Scaffold this active site. Structure first.
Site, PDB file in Angstrom:
ATOM      1  N   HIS A  77      -7.377  -5.759  -2.253  1.00  0.00           N
ATOM      2  CA  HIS A  77      -6.237  -4.963  -1.813  1.00  0.00           C
ATOM      3  C   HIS A  77      -5.573  -5.568  -0.583  1.00  0.00           C
ATOM      4  O   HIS A  77      -4.359  -5.421  -0.398  1.00  0.00           O
ATOM      5  CB  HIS A  77      -6.676  -3.529  -1.525  1.00  0.00           C
ATOM      6  CG  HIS A  77      -5.669  -2.737  -0.755  1.00  0.00           C
ATOM      7  ND1 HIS A  77      -5.767  -2.535   0.604  1.00  0.00           N
ATOM      8  CD2 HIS A  77      -4.537  -2.108  -1.150  1.00  0.00           C
ATOM      9  CE1 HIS A  77      -4.739  -1.812   1.014  1.00  0.00           C
ATOM     10  NE2 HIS A  77      -3.979  -1.539  -0.031  1.00  0.00           N
ATOM     11  N   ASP A  91       0.836  -1.196   0.000  1.00  0.00           N
ATOM     12  CA  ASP A  91       0.000   0.000   0.000  1.00  0.00           C
ATOM     13  C   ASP A  91       0.873   1.249   0.000  1.00  0.00           C
ATOM     14  O   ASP A  91       1.668   1.447  -0.924  1.00  0.00           O
ATOM     15  CB  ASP A  91      -0.972   0.001   1.184  1.00  0.00           C
ATOM     16  CG  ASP A  91      -2.040   1.063   1.053  1.00  0.00           C
ATOM     17  OD1 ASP A  91      -2.935   0.891   0.203  1.00  0.00           O
ATOM     18  OD2 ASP A  91      -1.980   2.069   1.793  1.00  0.00           O
TER      19      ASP A  91
HETATM   20  O1  LIG Z   1      -4.805   4.969  -0.551  1.00  0.00           O
HETATM   21  C1  LIG Z   1      -4.042   4.084  -0.750  1.00  0.00           C
HETATM   22  N1  LIG Z   1      -4.368   2.698  -0.446  1.00  0.00           N
HETATM   23  C2  LIG Z   1      -5.648   2.273   0.106  1.00  0.00           C
HETATM   24  C3  LIG Z   1      -6.819   2.754  -0.453  1.00  0.00           C
HETATM   25  C4  LIG Z   1      -8.042   2.349   0.048  1.00  0.00           C
HETATM   26  C5  LIG Z   1      -8.085   1.449   1.098  1.00  0.00           C
HETATM   27  O2  LIG Z   1      -9.322   1.035   1.589  1.00  0.00           O
HETATM   28  C6  LIG Z   1      -9.662  -0.243   1.136  1.00  0.00           C
HETATM   29  F1  LIG Z   1      -8.892  -0.561   0.054  1.00  0.00           F
HETATM   30  F2  LIG Z   1      -9.452  -1.143   2.141  1.00  0.00           F
HETATM   31  F3  LIG Z   1     -10.969  -0.268   0.759  1.00  0.00           F
HETATM   32  C7  LIG Z   1      -6.918   0.950   1.656  1.00  0.00           C
HETATM   33  C8  LIG Z   1      -5.696   1.362   1.150  1.00  0.00           C
HETATM   34  N2  LIG Z   1      -2.736   4.357  -1.326  1.00  0.00           N
HETATM   35  C9  LIG Z   1      -1.753   3.243  -1.572  1.00  0.00           C
HETATM   36  C10 LIG Z   1      -0.723   3.478  -2.671  1.00  0.00           C
HETATM   37  C11 LIG Z   1      -0.160   4.836  -2.563  1.00  0.00           C
HETATM   38  C12 LIG Z   1       1.033   4.938  -3.519  1.00  0.00           C
HETATM   39  C13 LIG Z   1       1.029   6.130  -4.485  1.00  0.00           C
HETATM   40  C14 LIG Z   1       1.530   7.368  -4.067  1.00  0.00           C
HETATM   41  N3  LIG Z   1       1.537   8.392  -4.911  1.00  0.00           N
HETATM   42  C15 LIG Z   1       1.084   8.271  -6.194  1.00  0.00           C
HETATM   43  C16 LIG Z   1       1.127   9.417  -7.048  1.00  0.00           C
HETATM   44  C17 LIG Z   1       0.673   9.324  -8.358  1.00  0.00           C
HETATM   45  C18 LIG Z   1       0.174   8.111  -8.840  1.00  0.00           C
HETATM   46  C19 LIG Z   1       0.132   6.992  -8.010  1.00  0.00           C
HETATM   47  C20 LIG Z   1       0.598   7.087  -6.665  1.00  0.00           C
HETATM   48  C21 LIG Z   1       0.569   5.958  -5.789  1.00  0.00           C
HETATM   49  C22 LIG Z   1      -1.237   5.813  -2.819  1.00  0.00           C
HETATM   50  C23 LIG Z   1      -2.255   5.740  -1.681  1.00  0.00           C
END
Ligand SMILES: O=C(Nc1ccc(OC(F)(F)F)cc1)N1CCC(Cc2cnc3ccccc3c2)CC1
Length: 336
Positions: free
Chosen positions: A313, A116
């Protein structure tokens, strides 16, 4: 050895605190069977925790690896500074270097594993500190290029782009931090985050509107967490000072900050290049980060390994016995 997943406050691991770069860093220490081959640092994401590697750490310990898995900035027994600059992927990459060198020496080398947000860390840490990452891998999270321009996330989704990221708006906003405080909201919050649904199939989380607060009273106990880890995720999240999610959500409030660091490196610094072995474990139903986003990942690597688990995820626990299988075999041949 007992290779089953780690139980809450499992005795087969050590819970140690170590001050690095100004803050207390809680971590778990999982130690090898016999003489270690390497030390492996495991990095979780949002809203995970060092405990989120329950299927991996004992398995890697049983493979002869020394495993350290720190609670990141804002999570659990690790500090959450007010400074936003401390939650930039650079400073936290500098953290993982210091925590690593705290275990193998300044010239030592580590197998780095993140997922993540931690998946974006271990590429940055492999970019900033290639002196140290003998082999790096990331689950679910593919490499994103160095940021060259800063755009407020509001403006990007306002033009219909990056709509798979429209949840960070509210997350970075005051809502999740103000509405989820205390064991009770945190518990229901974790039911939501780990696949919980309400009486009519309402979901506690969606990628477009983020946390839905109206459903979280009605949401059931989660498919991807039994009762004891749900209560372990909440006992541990309660460790942070209220509002307990300032730190965990702080990982989203650093868009402009990381931009300044990478606009520096995209223009002056070296290009995004990985000459050390690398695994990438995509999760199919990762509705957060679709495996198509991986895209042109491979053009940045000397030796990249691709993999994919038919899973959400939450690939470390759902497909844990298939993820352990994938990392192990890659690790075995990557180190030879
Ligand atoms: O929010 C994240 N993960 C996540 C989302 C929802 C969730 O809830 C559930 F999935 F459980 F429902 C649980 C986790 N991220 C993880 C990967 C990060 C890496 C990243 C950083 N900058 C970037 C900039 C430009 C392009 C891509 C980029 C990717 C971003 C946030």
């Amino acid at each position: 050895m007992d290779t089953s997943k780690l139980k809450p406050n499992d005795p087969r691991v050590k819970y140690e605190t170590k001050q690095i770069r100004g803050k207390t860093y809680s971590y778990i220490l999982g130690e090898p069977a016999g003489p270690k081959l390497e030390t492996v640092v495991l990095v979780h994401g949002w809203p995970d925790m060092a405990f989120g590697w329950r299927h991996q750490i004992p398995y890697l310990m049983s493979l002869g690896f020394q495993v350290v898995a720190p609670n990141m900035l804002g999570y659990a027994g690790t500090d959450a500074p007010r400074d936003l600059s401390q939650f930039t992927l650079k400073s936290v990459s500098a953290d993982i270097a210091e925590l690593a060198r705290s275990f193998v020496g300044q010239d030592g080398q580590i197998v780095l594993g993140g997922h993540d947000w931690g998946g974006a860390v271990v590429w940055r840490t492999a970019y900033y500190h290639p002196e140290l990452v003998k082999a790096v891998f990331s689950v679910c999270t593919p490499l994103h290029p160095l940021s060259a321009e800063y755009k407020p996330l509001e403006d990007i989704v306002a033009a219909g782009h990056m709509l798979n990221f429209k949840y960070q708006l509210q997350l970075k906003g005051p809502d999740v931090e103000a509405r989820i405080q205390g064991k009770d909201m945190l518990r229901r919050f974790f039911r939501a985050m780990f696949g919980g649904r309400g009486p009519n199939g309402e979901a506690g989380f969606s990628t477009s509107d983020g946390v839905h607060f109206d459903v979280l009273d009605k949401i059931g106990a989660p498919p991807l967490l039994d009762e004891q880890e749900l209560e372990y995720y909440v006992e541990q999240y309660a460790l942070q000072e209220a509002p307990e999610l300032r730190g965990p959500l702080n990982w989203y409030r650093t868009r402009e900050l990381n931009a300044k660091d990478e606009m520096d490196r995209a223009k002056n610094g070296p290009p995004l290049r990985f000459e050390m072995p690398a695994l990438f474990v995509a999760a199919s139903k990762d509705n957060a980060l679709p495996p198509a986003m991986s895209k042109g990942m491979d053009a940045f690597y000397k030796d990249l390994t691709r993999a994919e688990v038919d899973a959400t995820h939450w690939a470390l626990t759902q497909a844990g016995d298939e993820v352990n299988r994938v990392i192990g075999e890659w690790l075995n041949k990557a180190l030879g």
